[PDB]
Ligand binder design. Structure first.
Ligand SMILES: O=C([O-])CC(=O)C(=O)O
Ligand SMILES: O=C([O-])CC(=O)C(=O)O
Ligand SMILES: O=C([O-])CC(=O)C(=O)O
Ligand SMILES: [Mg+2]
Ligand SMILES: [Mg+2]
Ligand SMILES: [Mg+2]
Lengths: 231, 231, 231
């Protein structure tokens, strides 16, 4: 995949239909999500694995030039292990959420290698420890890109999100700087307000000014908006 | 004392009458202050010790559940040593202002134990070094809560305070993050404007969004406002 | 040169005429610039050196009490070595842009010592690494002052500058804090807009609030304005 992704669009791993609609807006990359998008039960996570596996295969064959990623559950969740069975060399990479130390990313890299699944890692820095150890996490060789997850960050610190985002400015700035120092591409925060392009435009602008090279998108319409600011 | 304190109300150590009025606003915790609240004269300090002691003694008995703290003078001040003699096991904890190194916090903890005073420490992070070494200070076991003192922080850096507080956003964000990583309760900055409830409301909202679990209060009226945002 | 510089005014190193005007606004210090001010070709830099060298000399003889500095090119640039010949013992010091490690600053000090140039360093922290290692760079003994260059910082991170400057608040606050902790005087960012003193006034105000003790100036008119805020 390109070292630069201007837009990264998500779809629930257990929604074959939404996964297939992923290329419509032509995002630079997409993420079939087995984490947040799917219920936290052993049953839901198991049911989602074959669905996302086949959906990923179909998608890559239909849109050969689309960078396709799969987001697995956190390293320390009881789902990480079995999520790996979903991966294939055809994916552009694997998204690992809530990483918190360089050792965790190295563990991930080694486990992937032992499953014969050499996939670059798109690191999720979205907790206090992830931000604090941002540089150490991104210096792991296998980490090619990273996103700052404001939503989980504030939840982790017992904070609350605002439109301006001053409450995550410190964190968002640290991640962008650590990303520059390690040669890793930084992906900006999601925008949950889906009814106003203006709210998104203002947010993307802040992210661009900070040095992020791309932005996470949760709705197709945000893709075109993202391309007006990154790239 | 509770792990979380929504409000912490201050009262001058040498003002036995005000100390007694403390329970009125029903704050989660109160601080009998021998530091800033009293004049910096070797005589005005030694004269405040007996008044603070006797006032704290009677206050704790009058409201046994209420978390009662006494703020002593800085570790390297000429008053610290003698201030300790004022403390008692019945206190919920001791407030130590201007801590700047993990080593200073450990020193305080050791001295307290040697004086047979089992008191958890409420660390004052309000200087450049305090903020810089926030995590190292807060990881000391005896430290249970910590507050960011914007007033003395700006004074220490030669800065100046504003209503928006952007000049201490980096510092306030760093303390909140370090508090999370160490399991320490973070207490937000004071609001010196005692005539406008909107200034406090907006200020408290910023602290809450950043991850603070409580806020320092200098006037009984701010207590109710604090509980509107923290809890 | 005093430990405190409220204003530091720049002039192109290849303009003998502009350099001569430097003393008119009575800035606390002046900088004859061989770096950004002079085009990036071996021809333009070599042509600039004798002018900066002699103009600096004529300046010191005319204004004996003025702190005169020369800004050489970056340490790892192909012009650094030759730029050193422009320096003389009579200068108040030398500005070294884009410093990124403590070791780089020590290298400069060493090379200055072997040339018999007792010139303290005014370090330029204006790239991701410069900000990341701000404290280590400033703890180098010969570093007496440091400036934060928001322009090159955002360029280095691939961001964009805004009037409000929230995109560089993190870095600006960090440089100011590190300067306090190392005993180094921190100089605030340049203001490129010259048609409005109000834009400069608001900016200087932000810098002062964060703890900066002086501000870089690129137009003599900014000198008096800086003096209203610093000192
Ligand atoms: O799942 C989503 O839609 C967005 C997400 O995880 C994130 O921004 O971290
Ligand atoms: O004593 C006060 O009024 C305020 C105080 O200590 C602080 O903000 O740290
Ligand atoms: O060259 C200039 O005029 C200003 C400059 O380098 C800076 O602010 O770093
Ligand atoms: Mg997320
Ligand atoms: Mg205080
Ligand atoms: Mg510069």
């Amino acid at each position: 995949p390109p070292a630069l992704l201007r837009s990264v669009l998500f779809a629930p791993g257990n929604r074959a239909d939404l996964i297939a609609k992923l290329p419509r807006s032509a995002p630079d990359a997409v993420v079939i999500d087995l984490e947040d998008a799917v219920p936290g039960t052993a049953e839901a996570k198991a049911a989602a694995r074959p669905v996302a596996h086949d959906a990923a295969r179909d998608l890559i064959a239909a849109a050969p030039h689309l960078a396709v990623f799969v987001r697995v559950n956190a390293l320390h969740s009881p789902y990480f292990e079995d999520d790996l069975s979903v991966l294939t060399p055809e994916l552009s990479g694997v998204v690992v959420p809530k990483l918190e130390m360089g050792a965790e990313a190295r563990q991930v890299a080694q486990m992937l290698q032992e499953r014969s699944l050499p996939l670059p890692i798109l690191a999720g820095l979205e907790t206090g420890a992830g931000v604090w150890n941002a540089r150490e996490i991104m210096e792991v060789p296998e980490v090619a890109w990273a996103y700052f997850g404001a939503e989980d960050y504030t939840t982790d610190l017992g904070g609350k999100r605002t439109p301006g985002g001053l409450e995550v400015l410190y964190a968002r700035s640290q991640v962008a700087l650590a990303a520059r120092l390690t040669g890793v591409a930084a992906l900006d925060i999601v925008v949950t307000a889906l009814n106003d392009p203006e709210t998104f435009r203002a947010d993307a602008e802040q992210g661009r000014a900070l040095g992020y090279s791309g932005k996470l998108c949760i709705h197709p319409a945000q893709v075109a908006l993202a391309h007006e600011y990154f790239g």
